[PDB]
RNA sequence: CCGGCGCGCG
């Protein structure tokens, strides 16, 4: 007897901004849901007929929200243990402060040259960096090279994730694990963190997932017929994102991130 | 040789090469003076022979230390990229590195082609940058590098010292920048003027800008 | 199902297994006879809840408990479910393989 | 009759002329019996398969044999969109046992 | 004979209309169509006949399956096998191996594993043989994505447990060496390469004619990177006896223009003196800097290796380890094993630096304040363990006797891959005190390796010899 | 044709 072979599979995976655009292509730009008088779908709104379809396709057609600033995914930062913190190898407190407080990260990227001795996450603002360096380096060129030595928020996280060398991560983790072994509570927990980090970095190499997708550049929008509460949270994202692009300031950047976190996962 | 220099003087200088021009200037060793303890000149030499000639000419003017800024274009002159950086390293103490006109070609690859003449690459240089330490050359010289000419020449101007000298080359009297396909407007003389204008505050603000990385006061 | 897994010991470093990894008992013994690459393991007793969260299907775990935790961990590594179980095909509305 | 707007499943309640729920405990009993085709009836084209609900209404009136749905019910498509809203993509693939060609099911 | 399948079908229909038995004519037509090389029409006619209730001979079934699988047509072969099993002839290991020959190249190991599971837990005539294990292993080691080292290891264990009925061949060891090389399990690759050496061809099979990235070159590179120079020399002898020239991938040239000849001595990733300045202009010109074909060593965003040497491995090549370091590591691991079986005040600041002068008074203070400016074993011996082996009681030996009496475990279950596959040489590479590294040993090994690489067709560079009369024999000059 | 609160039946 030859078995009647059936090879069927389904796979989840972290999505890319390009695939989000391919889903939408179709961007929701206005927070208006419906007309107060005519009870018609507002154009470019959460229920736009052009974006989603005539009033079957409205159950499946997706949209997206073009966020001015990248926002981290709450599942991959705030859930314990943090995946972003483990892959970046930093304590959760400093990452949360970088995302939620007025903290700036020194040396966020490596694959481009720098010229400063700024390391770590300096909580206080650098006095020289406020006036001295920008006033000597003017504005246009300074902003051109600005996002290479000091940055803040989820943009710094995305920059750190994008330029990560996973193989170097695996090798450093393995050598540190060997050093720890060749030498008793967190002498083991540090080892367990190291084992968890190489297994996390190994999975990225063999898959098509990118660790920078853990910070969102676009926000997919649920089809309208599935949300005839969720609508209110979608307006807030547009409410605070459209405010942010009008400015272009740090406080509004945090407000957009909190709107996405509440929409994605509250009570966390 | 010196046709531009001769015509301007006839219609109306540093080194012994310009002395014969007087006996018989925009983009030809245009001195940039802002009451500093050094000098800044601009030359159009984008060729190894002319660059070598001028770099030899600087030595005869008795400079205490030699600092040079060099670059190369993209999609062209691919067969002689490392020679300028080789001669600059063998003729100058601390040499800044950048591009001349990257064009469509990515400037990072050309800047890698710079270090090929010394036994380095962008990978090794950037690993040096991560460890915030740059061991000197074989002949005791120093090497620093930056992708964009802007901050590179700003730091070079900030590194003008007493009896010292800084060369920025590759552009000359041309006042355009070639990135991708758009010819951006960029003047080396005016940018050097601006850098010389406001050099004081960067050094007096507690920042030891003497070398990469700068020893910031609160960064240790 | 309670007594079908072993725990890779904290000192077992290899490219086949990592320390703390939960592997099947039969697989562990088979690799023991074939490799001598520090295949160190100890028998572990799993409860009916912990065992149900270490299955070969992420749909079965997501529909059992901690849906957000299961889906977040799985979606990071592109996990593939081959729908060999009864509950997986119930979710899809297809015919169960029984 | 009438179905829910989102889940597209039959309504709940006698006053609303709704249907009876086949809970997970009822699904276990059917799996214990091995009646895999009774279970699929009450999972796809008696609950939420919009396309297959309409054809069952037509075939039974003419008595011309009911075929297998082969597509996904609206409850699974509803879950896929929700997972898309969390930046997660869930794709269903069929691998042919003949020529090993991967077929992406519409979901 | 002419390939006129439709004419043959019309003649068969005419035969049927004339109340004739068309089975013999159908068989003759199918066989003729196969012989004349019309496999498509032969398959169509055979499938028409089989679906019509007609039964073919065993020879015709086997011919159809084998030809279809040789042509890469898995669909027709699977259909014909299903029809043959419907007609009353069950599939054996031959038909299953024919089917597996095509599934192993589909890029999805699960198809081949489903077929293997069908074979393994079936009847006696469907049981897997060496070819089946080879097909499934090849399917798993050449997967498109995800790791499969665990699957291959478990499959190898299952094959080992089937020793009384199955034994390996050259392809088994070649596939295992390739798998354990791509995943950087180097010691297992060395074991299986030792097993593979005894087969003629051997490393030639592992070479795979350069296809599949040329795993033989990967084996040589993995041996070189970890400083397993004795094993590298043994591999070189293996290819020399097999008349296998060292491929260019194995002879890849390092960052500092070095190769496997000089990469494990105390100058690591550095050049030698060479007696003169290095011609960097020549290096730039010869590397393709004239036509834009150079390889720029700048890091880039993406999960791809910048180093061309890492191409082929699953998670990049093994890290560079000198032969001096590898010998010291082997000395330490042996002695860690030996210890295991046995049990069964300002001057203090000077130690943090190089102690420059100092000693009398105030020199220590000035230096401490100015220092801030810079800121017997029996492994593998199954017989010994079998001898030692001879409510479950808490006493370990009483417990062992209990599992012997309750048939939980017995000495008949104590065997490894070594003692069931006839690996008699394995006991000569274990339970031995490792040789201490020495400069004389390293230089003699370097000379031997250089000679063996030269005689194999691989030319070492001038920088390789500079690290070390043979230097000038290659055409060089200091 | 949406959710909360209260009261019930097996």
TrEMBL record, chain A:
It is found in: Plastid, Chloroplast. DNA-dependent RNA polymerase catalyzes the transcription of DNA into RNA using the four ribonucleoside triphosphates as substrates. In plastids the minimal PEP RNA polymerase catalytic core is composed of four subunits: alpha, beta, beta', and beta''. When a (nuclear-encoded) sigma factor is associated with the core the holoenzyme is formed, which can initiate transcription. Belongs to the RNA polymerase beta' chain family. RpoC1 subfamily. This is DNA-directed RNA polymerase subunit beta'. It comes from Sinapis alba (White mustard). The chain holds residues 1 to 340 of 680 of the full protein.
From TrEMBL, chain C:
It comes from the Eukaryota. Residues 1-53 form the RNA polymerase Rpb1 domain. It is found in: Plastid, Chloroplast. Coiled coil: none annotated. DNA-dependent RNA polymerase catalyzes the transcription of DNA into RNA using the four ribonucleoside triphosphates as substrates. In plastids the minimal PEP RNA polymerase catalytic core is composed of four subunits: alpha, beta, beta', and beta''. When a (nuclear-encoded) sigma factor is associated with the core the holoenzyme is formed, which can initiate transcription. Belongs to the RNA polymerase beta' chain family. RpoC2 subfamily. This is DNA-directed RNA polymerase subunit beta''. It comes from Sinapis alba (White mustard). The gene is rpoC2.
UniProtKB/TrEMBL annotation, chain D:
Residues 18-93 form the RNA polymerase Rpb2 domain. It comes from the Eukaryota. It is found in: Plastid, Chloroplast. DNA-dependent RNA polymerase catalyzes the transcription of DNA into RNA using the four ribonucleoside triphosphates as substrates. Belongs to the RNA polymerase beta chain family. In plastids the minimal PEP RNA polymerase catalytic core is composed of four subunits: alpha, beta, beta', and beta''. When a (nuclear-encoded) sigma factor is associated with the core the holoenzyme is formed, which can initiate transcription. This is DNA-directed RNA polymerase subunit beta. It comes from Sinapis alba (White mustard). The chain holds residues 966 to 1072 of 1072 of the full protein.
